[PDB]
Design a binder for this molecule. Structure first.
Ligand SMILES: Nc1ncnc2c1ncn2[C@@H]1O[C@H](COP(=O)(O)OP(=O)(O)OP(=O)(O)O)[C@@H](O)[C@H]1O
Ligand SMILES: [Cl-]
Ligand SMILES: [Mg+2]
Length: 485
């Protein structure tokens, strides 16, 4: 596809046409949906044989309109009370597993996951080549999937935006299993972005809840899931901004936002100040961190709560870079013949140097001023860097200093047999030995305190080595400098 898709997007008229074509290409065909329906029908048959009156509800990527090729098939099986109710649940889970493993034909790789936040049973159907999860209870997943598809129905730009930004995110390494953003979290971030535009593209979940209607009220796990089943009773958006504009605006927005001190509410369509303690007092069980994104229904759940500060910072970095790219003429204007334009450089893999310079380096806690002073102390001395003027400095290195420190250290130890930090490391540095060999930039943001090291001039391409070496070296430096007190 990486060939076919590339030339397909290259031939498009404009950026919007590229995003639309991207949706058209990545989404499940009719045969894939028929196949998934077949599998769901089978699971339904067997589970019916076991649990009379049970209903297998497809949820997630399948029904939320954000479906892509090879996506998971997620199924929800609908059928003195202490913590034991957890154990009971687990039991039932295994029961379901034992049904999947030995009863329904052609399903293998059956793996019970009671340990997960939301308990689930992984499975793979062999003939269809499909895989996914059976959840005994996640009821909210249904309703917020319906909410996603409804959001797609509310504005036609939603699907192109979300598809493009998902592709970009997985291309920039912002989405995955680790403390990366989930596709659902990223989708909710896009929806939040669309809700926060000056004319709103999408309505808030509060407004949809108000829209409601008789009998359409629904409550799950003590949360209000009620929203209209169709978009016909809902007035359209007067925001006329074209797709490319909304994309650039996304990048710029999430790059300019304050994530640490903001819980992003899709319900109220607003940024609620985190510090101190305000949203935490209302809905208990809300874990706050580098990125805070509130579920539209369960308000005690931060969907991004898993994301580490390095990942959030990397997000904002990549978004600043992408916004900077969209400001160019390569993004706006098409190419005469064969050149990469518009969406292509965004969906193309990022250089290893950019790959590293996007994700910052976590530094020990310390006063911003004292920390920055410590850093310029570590670059000035203990490193051969010539330094000059969130705080940022331009640094120039004429030397190989990151490499061969071990040999100089050995030499200095045996020559110590002959006869705290800072200057002692500066010995190791200066004993390692006019256009600069490598010139780079070091930036420390207020929140969190982290160093973003980006290259300027790198003729021989040595920047990644310096970056990894600094990843190891700078925390040690700040550490011993903290221990001098
Ligand atoms: N990290 C999460 N926190 C809370 N709810 C989630 C999370 N991830 C997914 N969900 C809910 O359950 C569904 C899980 O689907 P899944 O884990 O397969 O991701 P997805 O959105 O379906 O995309 P994909 O299928 O490609 O992973 C989501 O659509 C959402 O309804
Ligand atoms: Cl903004
Ligand atoms: Mg899915």
């Amino acid at each position: 596809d990486s060939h076919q898709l590339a030339k397909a997007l290259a031939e498009a008229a404009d950026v919007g046409a590229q995003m639309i074509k991207l949706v058209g290409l990545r989404e499940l065909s009719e045969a894939e949906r028929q196949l998934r329906s077949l599998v769901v029908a089978l699971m339904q048959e067997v589970f019916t044989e076991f649990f009379p009156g049970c209903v297998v509800h497809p949820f997630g990527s399948s029904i939320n309109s954000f479906d892509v090729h090879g996506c998971d098939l997620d199924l929800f099986l609908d059928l003195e009370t202490p913590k034991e109710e957890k154990a009971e649940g687990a039991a039932m889970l295994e029961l379901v597993g034992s049904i999947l493993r030995g009863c329904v034909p052609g399903v293998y790789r059956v793996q019970t996951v009671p340990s997960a936040r939301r308990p689930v049973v992984k499975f793979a159907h062999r003939p269809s080549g499909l895989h996914g999860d059976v959840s005994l209870s996640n009821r909210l997943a249904l309703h917020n999937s319906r909410f996603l598809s409804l959001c797609s129905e509310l504005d036609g730009r939603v699907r192109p935006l979300v598809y493009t930004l998902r592709a970009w995110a997985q291309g920039r390494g912002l989405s995955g299993s680790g403390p990366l953003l989930s596709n659902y979290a990223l989708t909710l971030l896009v929806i939040y972005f669309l809700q926060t535009r000056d004319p709103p593209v999408l309505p808030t979940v509060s407004q949809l809840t108000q829209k409601a209607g008789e009998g359409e009220q629904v409550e799950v796990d003590g949360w209000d899931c009620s929203f209209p089943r169709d978009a016909s009773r809902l007035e359209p958006s007067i925001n006329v901004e074209p797709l490319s504009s909304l994309l650039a605006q996304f990048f710029s927005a999430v790059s300019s936002w304050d994530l640490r001190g903001s819980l992003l509410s899709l319900r109220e369509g607003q940024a609620l100040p985190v510090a101190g303690g305000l949203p935490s007092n209302l809905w208990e069980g809300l874990r706050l961190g580098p990125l805070n994104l509130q579920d539209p229904f369960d308000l005690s759940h931060n969907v991004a709560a898993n994301v580490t500060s390095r990942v959030a910072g990397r997000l904002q970095n990549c978004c600043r870079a992408a916004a900077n790219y969209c400001r160019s003429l390569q993004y706006q204007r098409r190419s005469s013949r064969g050149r990469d334009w518009g969406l292509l450089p965004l969906l193309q893999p990022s250089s290893p140097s950019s790959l590293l310079s996007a994700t910052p380096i976590p530094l020990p806690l310390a006063p911003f001023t004292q920390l920055t002073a410590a850093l310029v102390q570590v670059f000035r001395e203990a490193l051969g860097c010539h330094i000059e003027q969130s705080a940022s400095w331009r640094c120039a290195l004429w030397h190989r200093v990151w490499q061969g420190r071990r040999r100089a250290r050995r030499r200095l130890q045996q020559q110590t047999k002959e006869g705290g930090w800072l200057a002692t490391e500066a010995q190791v540095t200066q004993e390692l030995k006019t256009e600069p060999l490598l010139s780079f930039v070091a930036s420390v943001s207020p929140a969190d305190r982290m160093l973003t090291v980006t290259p300027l001039q790198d003729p021989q391409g040595l920047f990644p080595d310096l970056h990894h070496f600094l990843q190891v070296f700078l925390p040690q430096a700040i550490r011993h400098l903290k221990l001098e007190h």
